[PDB]
Amino acid sequence: MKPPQFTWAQWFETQHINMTSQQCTNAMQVINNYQRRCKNQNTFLLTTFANVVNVCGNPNMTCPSNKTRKNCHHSGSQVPLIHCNLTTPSPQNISNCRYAQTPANMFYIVACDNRDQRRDPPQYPVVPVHLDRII
């Protein structure tokens, strides 16, 4: 889920672009402390927000993860990524969740939408709002 203070684009950035530490256990604390639960799996794309916004400009395609959606876009270029996997689930205390990290270079498919009119900066009319898939 998404904390109230973030727009979908801001939450996308927090979850898949701003890896605050090259270590998943530490990087995931940010996401988990925000959504009050240890996310089982999360991919951090080693790319820039602007790079992803531009991928939103690639042709529209069906979202592999939600076949009814056509707001997805394929990167057209593989990128380095770190995939975090929960190794130590801790529902009674989320700061004790540990993760494994798996490096890879793959393509990414992102769902994009028009920006949150009120909260998203006007600089980017179109923004990524969901990481639909890594292929």
Ligand SMILES: Nc1ncnc2c1ncn2[C@@H]1O[C@H](COP(=O)(O)OP(=O)(O)O)[C@@H](O)[C@H]1O
């Ligand atoms: N590579 C993956 N394989 C399987 N499940 C995943 C993967 N990445 C994330 N998930 C799971 O999918 C759900 C949504 O996460 P995510 O795919 O990152 O979407 P979003 O960008 O909308 O937050 C979470 O339960 C997460 O643990």
